[PDB]
Amino acid sequence: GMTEYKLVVVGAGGVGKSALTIQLIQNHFVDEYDPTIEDSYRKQVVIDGETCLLDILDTAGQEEYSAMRDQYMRTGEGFLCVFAINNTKSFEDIHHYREQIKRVQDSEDVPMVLVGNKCDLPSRTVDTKQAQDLARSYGIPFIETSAKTRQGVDDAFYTLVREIRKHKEK
Ligand SMILES: Nc1nc2c(ncn2[C@@H]2O[C@H](COP(=O)(O)OP(=O)(O)O)[C@@H](O)[C@H]2O)c(=O)[nH]1
Ligand SMILES: [Mg+2]
């Protein structure tokens, strides 16, 4: 059967996790998507000529119990850790999301990509060097994205799949 990559999108409210996921899946930019809604998406893609399925959980950081949330956090193969380049607080929050992933995976080596979203906006308060320095500290890729323009969106998800492939061949 076709290989499935189970991916989880995490980060502070308002960074564009839902917009990024819908851009990947539906190829349009959504201005308004309920900040409390957590849902999974499945998409067949070709990455470096490998036809595969992306099984993505768009997390919403809500209190209410979800069996699906626990399952994706436990069995997820890769995580997008998303901040917004015009939201210093969302960048300050990244370490908390990475710590949560390491604890649920019981691993120091979980495939992850650091995503700086909203790179279409001129009011950048988190610079490339700061983001590259954090990614280097974690030993993970840094990808700049815009859910609005689609800049870097395929690159973010496809880079995470390449990190998972590397982990599986370790
Ligand atoms: N300019 C810009 N706005 C964005 C981008 N991605 C998301 N947004 C906006 O940021 C707000 C929060 O996005 P959303 O996907 O709900 O964030 P989530 O809470 O992380 O799921 C919304 O008003 C979006 O339209 C982007 O790349 N550029
Ligand atoms: Mg959302």
Swiss-Prot record:
InterPro entries named among the record's database cross-references: P-loop_NTPase, Small_GTP-bd, Small_GTPase, Small_GTPase_Ras-type
Superkingdom, natural source: Eukaryota
A cellular component annotation (GO) from this entry: plasma membrane
Cellular compartments annotated: Cell membrane; Endomembrane system; Cytoplasm, Cytosol
Effect of G13R: In lung cancer and bladder cancer; somatic mutation
Topology class, membrane: Lipid-anchor
Keyword Protein transport: no
Modified residues (N-acetylthreonine): T3
Binding site for GTP: 11-19, 30-36, 60-61, 117-120
Modification after translation (UniProt): Lysine-depalmitoylation by SIRT2 promotes its localization to endomembranes in endocytic pathways. (Microbial infection) Glucosylated at Thr-36 by P.sordellii toxin TcsL.
Illness the protein is tied to: Leukemia, acute myelogenous: A subtype of acute leukemia, a cancer of the white blood cells. AML is a malignant disease of bone marrow characterized by maturational arrest of hematopoietic precursors at an early stage of development. Clonal expansion of myeloid blasts occurs in bone marrow, blood, and other tissue. Myelogenous leukemias develop from changes in cells that normally produce neutrophils, basophils, eosinophils and monocytes. Leukemia, juvenile myelomonocytic: An aggressive pediatric myelodysplastic syndrome/myeloproliferative disorder characterized by malignant transformation in the hematopoietic stem cell compartment with proliferation of differentiated progeny. Patients have splenomegaly, enlarged lymph nodes, rashes, and hemorrhages.
Subunit structure as annotated in this protein's UniProt entry: Interacts with PHLPP. Interacts (active GTP-bound form preferentially) with RGS14. Interacts (when farnesylated) with PDE6D; this promotes dissociation from the cell membrane. Interacts with SOS1. Interacts (when farnesylated) with GPR31. Interacts with RAP1GDS1. Interacts (active GTP-bound form) with both SHOC2 and PP1c (all isoforms) to form a tertiary complex; SHOC2 and PP1c preferably bind M-Ras/MRAS, but they also bind K-Ras/KRAS, N-Ras/NRAS and H-Ras/HRAS. Interacts (GTP-bound form) with MAPKAP1/SIN1; inhibiting K-Ras/KRAS activity.
UniProt-recorded name of the protein: GTPase KRas
Species name: Homo sapiens (Human)
Lineage: Eukaryota, Metazoa, Chordata, Craniata, Vertebrata
Recorded name of the encoding gene: KRAS
